[PDB]
Amino acid sequence: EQESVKEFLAKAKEEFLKKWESPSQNTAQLDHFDRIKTLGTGSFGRVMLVKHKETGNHYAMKILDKQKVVKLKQIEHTLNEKRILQAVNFPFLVKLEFSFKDNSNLYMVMEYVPGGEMFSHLRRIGRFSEPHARFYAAQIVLTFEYLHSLDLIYRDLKPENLLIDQQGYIQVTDFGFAKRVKGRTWTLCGTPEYLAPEIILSKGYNKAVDWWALGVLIYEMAAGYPPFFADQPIQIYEKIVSGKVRFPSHFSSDLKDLLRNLLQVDLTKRFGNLKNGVNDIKNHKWFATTDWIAIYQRKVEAPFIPKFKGPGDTSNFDDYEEEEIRVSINEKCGKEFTEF
Numbered sequence: 001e002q003e004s005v006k007e008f009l010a011k012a013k014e015e016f017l018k019k020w021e022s023p024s025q026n027t028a029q030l031d032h033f034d035r036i037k038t039l040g041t042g043s044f045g046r047v048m049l050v051k052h053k054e055t056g057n058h059y060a061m062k063i064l065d066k067q068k069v070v071k072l073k074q075i076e077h078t079l080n081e082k083r084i085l086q087a088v089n090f091p092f093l094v095k096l097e098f099s100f101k102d103n104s105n106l107y108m109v110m111e112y113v114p115g116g117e118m119f120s121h122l123r124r125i126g127r128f129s130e131p132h133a134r135f136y137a138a139q140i141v142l143t144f145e146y147l148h149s150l151d152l153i154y155r156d157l158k159p160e161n162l163l164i165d166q167q168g169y170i171q172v173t174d175f176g177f178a179k180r181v182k183g184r185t186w187t188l189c190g191t192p193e194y195l196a197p198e199i200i201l202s203k204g205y206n207k208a209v210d211w212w213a214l215g216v217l218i219y220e221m222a223a224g225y226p227p228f229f230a231d232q233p234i235q236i237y238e239k240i241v242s243g244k245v246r247f248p249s250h251f252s253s254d255l256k257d258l259l260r261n262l263l264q265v266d267l268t269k270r271f272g273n274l275k276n277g278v279n280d281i282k283n284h285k286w287f288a289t290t291d292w293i294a295i296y297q298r299k300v301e302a303p304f305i306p307k308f309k310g311p312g313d314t315s316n317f318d319d320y321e322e323e324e325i326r327v328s329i330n331e332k333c334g335k336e337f338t339e340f
């Protein structure tokens with residue numbers, strides 16, 4: 001690669017390792033914030049819009065229930081998420097501003113991106129044109145180049161995890177399955193439609209699973225639906241391990257060729273995992289119009305800007321039952337979460 005790219009990545013790794021080896025802890029508390037609205041909810045946590053009482057700034061606060069984290073075998077995953085987020089720095093990653101814990105919960109306080117999830121915009125418009133899909137895909141290619149050079153795998157790429165910001169660019173959120181991996185890793189995790197064959201088959205796997213998931217994401221952005229789907233997960237998995245993929249006739253020949261190389265069932269033949277690494281993707285014909293430096297510098301005009309009224313507008317997120325943030329009078333699971 002050009003020495004300027006090599007030097008960029010060498011410094012990125014130096015700065016990551018310094019924060020990785022000495023993580024920040026305990027940098028706010030719950031009563032520093034006013035609760036506004038629930039933005040999302042899952043099996044062991046939720047994300048709430050909050051406002052800091054002294055500065056007036058808005059944030060997305062992820063709240064994880066310690067007891068549910070333990071029951072669902074997510075302890076190490078939640079420790080990975082916070083340790084990685086407090087150590088990374090890249091234009092297309094949502095920034096962690098504070099973290100802390102109390103008797104009941106773990107808290108990660110992230111910047112609030114008001115434009116909504118890419119998933120909502122995709123389903124409202126139907127499908128993105130190839131230039132629009134390519135603008136987003138270029139940001140993911142650069143983000144994975146950064147993460148993989150730090151020995152990090154992301155493991156949850158899908159449209160719900162890509163937020164659209166006030167300039168129309170992507171912010172990747174949700175590091176719940178991200179991990180530092182120097183060789184292979186073995187946990188079964190991720191969303192069925194996006195899993196690579198080697199995860200489904202219980203093999204030791206590597207960063208090539210993120211490049212498979214980028215093929216699924218680019219197909220879904222340009223078609224409007226993912227390439228492998230079915231009513232039951234087991235039927236999705238049969239489709240994935242065949243890798244049989246039919247493309248819409250409106251796909252360009254260059255898009256089909258890129259996708260056959262990202263959706264390659266043999267991980268040793270998959271683009272992103274060959275001798276030339278990410279450069280097989282950056283130099284592919286489907287990306288011939290992409291100015292990689294201009295994208296990184298945020299100098300390209302975006303395909304659209306979300307409609308919203310201000311930094312606290314929630315109109316691009318959906319409505320959930322509003323539940324208490326209860327804090328037990330007694331400490332739960334203190335040992336398991338000592339390092340958080």
Ligand SMILES: O[C@@H]1CCN(Cc2nc(C3(O)CCNCC3)cs2)C1
Pocket residue numbers: 073076077186187
């Ligand atoms: O029963 C034994 C006593 C403690 N138990 C720890 C566990 N670890 C998992 C992991 O999935 C393994 C891979 N790394 C992510 C977490 C599931 S149970 C195992």
